[PDB]
Design a protein around this ligand. Structure first.
Ligand SMILES: CNC(=O)[C@H](CCCCNC(C)=O)NC(C)=O
Length: 130
């Protein structure tokens, strides 16, 4: 229905705003674009589902997220990819892991403060009816 279309449109607006706020944070610059395959050849071989904030925006615009739960799975993926690809004790790896965990924590904190639980519940119930 048009009411359900309106619900998912509001979801997309909300998700774009959250994503923009993460993307403009200097700490998360490393997560704003895909890892360049020409610069890092072995990334695509190790990480099976690459994810980054530009790709998240693309997926929002393609109507791929029908719930905030599904969005957070892709935020979790950005984080888990970083931990998987950069597991070593050296400062470079530890920095990206800290930033990845901060990205995840920040996204969850924004959603905790600004997502109405009844809005998410509605989204989930529309999704299940599809
Ligand atoms: C020129 N690039 C490199 O040397 C790469 C850099 C990888 C950047 C890691 N980014 C993320 C998002 O996990 N490092 C190696 C070990 O392949």
């Amino acid at each position: 229905s048009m009411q359900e279309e309106d619900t998912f449109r509001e979801l997309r607006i909300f998700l774009r705003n959250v994503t923009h706020r993460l993307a403009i944070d200097k700490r998360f610059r490393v997560f704003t674009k895909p890892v360049d395959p020409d610069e890092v050849p072995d990334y695509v071989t190790v990480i099976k589902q690459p994810m980054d904030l530009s790709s998240v925006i693309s997926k929002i615009d393609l109507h791929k997220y029908l719930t905030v739960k599904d969005y957070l799975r892709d935020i979790d993926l950005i984080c888990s990819n970083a931990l998987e690809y950069n597991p070593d004790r050296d400062p470079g790896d530890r920095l990206i892991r800290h930033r990845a965990c901060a990205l995840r924590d920040t996204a969850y904190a924004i959603i905790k403060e600004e997502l109405d639980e009844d809005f998410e519940q509605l989204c989930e119930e529309i999704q299940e009816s599809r």
